[PDB]
PDB file of C-alpha atoms in Angstrom:
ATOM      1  CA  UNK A   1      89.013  99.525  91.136  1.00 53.09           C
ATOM      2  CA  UNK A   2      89.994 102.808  89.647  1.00 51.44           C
ATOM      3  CA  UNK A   3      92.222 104.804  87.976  1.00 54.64           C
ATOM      4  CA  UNK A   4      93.884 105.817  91.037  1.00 54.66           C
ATOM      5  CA  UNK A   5      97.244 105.222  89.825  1.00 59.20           C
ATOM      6  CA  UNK A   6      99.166 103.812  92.644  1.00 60.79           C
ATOM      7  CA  UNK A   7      97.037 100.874  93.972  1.00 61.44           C
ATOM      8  CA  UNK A   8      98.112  98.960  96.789  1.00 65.24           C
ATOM      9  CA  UNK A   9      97.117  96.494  98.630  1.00 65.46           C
ATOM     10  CA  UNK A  10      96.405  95.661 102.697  1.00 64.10           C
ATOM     11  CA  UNK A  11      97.913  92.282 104.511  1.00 63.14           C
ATOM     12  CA  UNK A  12      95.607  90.766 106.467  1.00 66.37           C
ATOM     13  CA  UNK A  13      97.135  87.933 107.062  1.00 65.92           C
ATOM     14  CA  UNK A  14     100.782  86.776 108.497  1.00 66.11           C
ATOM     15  CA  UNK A  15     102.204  84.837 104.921  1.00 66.25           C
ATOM     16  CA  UNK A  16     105.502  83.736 105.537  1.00 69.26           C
ATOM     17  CA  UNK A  17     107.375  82.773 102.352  1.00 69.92           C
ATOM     18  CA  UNK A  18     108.503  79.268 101.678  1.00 69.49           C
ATOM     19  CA  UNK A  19     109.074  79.388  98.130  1.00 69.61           C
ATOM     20  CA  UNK A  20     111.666  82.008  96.494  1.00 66.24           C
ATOM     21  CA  UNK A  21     109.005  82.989  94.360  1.00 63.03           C
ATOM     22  CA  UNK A  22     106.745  84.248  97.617  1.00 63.58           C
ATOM     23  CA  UNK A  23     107.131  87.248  99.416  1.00 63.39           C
ATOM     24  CA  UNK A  24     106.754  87.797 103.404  1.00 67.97           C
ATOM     25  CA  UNK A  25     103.899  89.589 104.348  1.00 71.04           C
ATOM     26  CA  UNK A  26     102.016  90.180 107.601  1.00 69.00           C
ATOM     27  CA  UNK A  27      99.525  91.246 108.943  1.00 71.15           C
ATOM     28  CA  UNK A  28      99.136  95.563 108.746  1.00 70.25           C
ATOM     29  CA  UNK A  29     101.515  95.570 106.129  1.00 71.52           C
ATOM     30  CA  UNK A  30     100.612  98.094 103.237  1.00 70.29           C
ATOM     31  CA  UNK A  31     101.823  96.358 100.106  1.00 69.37           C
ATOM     32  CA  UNK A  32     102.284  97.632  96.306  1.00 69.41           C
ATOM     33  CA  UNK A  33     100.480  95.980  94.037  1.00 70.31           C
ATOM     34  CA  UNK A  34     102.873  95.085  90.748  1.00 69.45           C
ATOM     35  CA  UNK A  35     100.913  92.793  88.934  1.00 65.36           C
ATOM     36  CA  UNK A  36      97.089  91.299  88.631  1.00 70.25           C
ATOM     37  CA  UNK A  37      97.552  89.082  85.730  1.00 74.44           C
ATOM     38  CA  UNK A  38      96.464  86.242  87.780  1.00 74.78           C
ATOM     39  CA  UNK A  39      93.681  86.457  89.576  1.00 75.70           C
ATOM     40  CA  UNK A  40      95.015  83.577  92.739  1.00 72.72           C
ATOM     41  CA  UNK A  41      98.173  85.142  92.336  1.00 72.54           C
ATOM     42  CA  UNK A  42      99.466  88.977  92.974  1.00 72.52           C
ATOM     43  CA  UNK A  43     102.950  90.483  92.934  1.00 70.94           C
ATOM     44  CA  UNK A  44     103.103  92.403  95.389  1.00 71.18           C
ATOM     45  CA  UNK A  45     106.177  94.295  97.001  1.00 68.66           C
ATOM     46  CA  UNK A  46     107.328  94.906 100.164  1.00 69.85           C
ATOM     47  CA  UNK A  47     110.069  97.834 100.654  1.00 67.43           C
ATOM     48  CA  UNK A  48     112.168  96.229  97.991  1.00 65.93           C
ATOM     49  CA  UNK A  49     111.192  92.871  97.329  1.00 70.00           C
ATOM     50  CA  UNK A  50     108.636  91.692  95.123  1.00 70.93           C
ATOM     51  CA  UNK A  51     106.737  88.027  95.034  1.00 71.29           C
ATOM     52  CA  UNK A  52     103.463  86.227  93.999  1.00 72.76           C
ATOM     53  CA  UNK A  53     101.264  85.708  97.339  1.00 70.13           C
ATOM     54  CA  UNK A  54      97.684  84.439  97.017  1.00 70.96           C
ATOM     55  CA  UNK A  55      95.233  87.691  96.908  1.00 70.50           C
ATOM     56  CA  UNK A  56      92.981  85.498  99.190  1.00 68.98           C
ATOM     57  CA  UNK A  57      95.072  86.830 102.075  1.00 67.29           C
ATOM     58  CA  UNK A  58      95.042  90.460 100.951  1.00 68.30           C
ATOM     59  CA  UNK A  59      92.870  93.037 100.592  1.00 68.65           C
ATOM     60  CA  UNK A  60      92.248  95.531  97.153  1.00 66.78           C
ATOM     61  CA  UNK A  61      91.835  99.095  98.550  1.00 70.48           C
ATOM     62  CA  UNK A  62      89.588 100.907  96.026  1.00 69.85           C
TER      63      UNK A  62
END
């Protein structure tokens, strides 16, 4: 990655949520990527809502 500022990242897989802490996510859907602390698990947003969703079933874009 860079220093392109707004990174975000690409669904590429349908994750529904189960726990409150998850986010719904399919597959297509452009995400924003809040927070890479963990490296298993990403916040990422969707709209408005934000969760922690394994980044095995997303992709980085740059």
């Amino acid at each position: 990655m860079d220093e392109t500022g707004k990174e975000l990242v690409l669904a590429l897989y349908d994750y529904q949520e189960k726990s409150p802490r998850e986010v719904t996510m399919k597959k297509g859907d452009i995400l924003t990527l809040l927070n890479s602390t963990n490296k298993d698990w990403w916040k990422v947003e969707v709209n408005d809502r934000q969760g922690f969703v394994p980044a095995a079933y997303v992709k980085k874009l740059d």
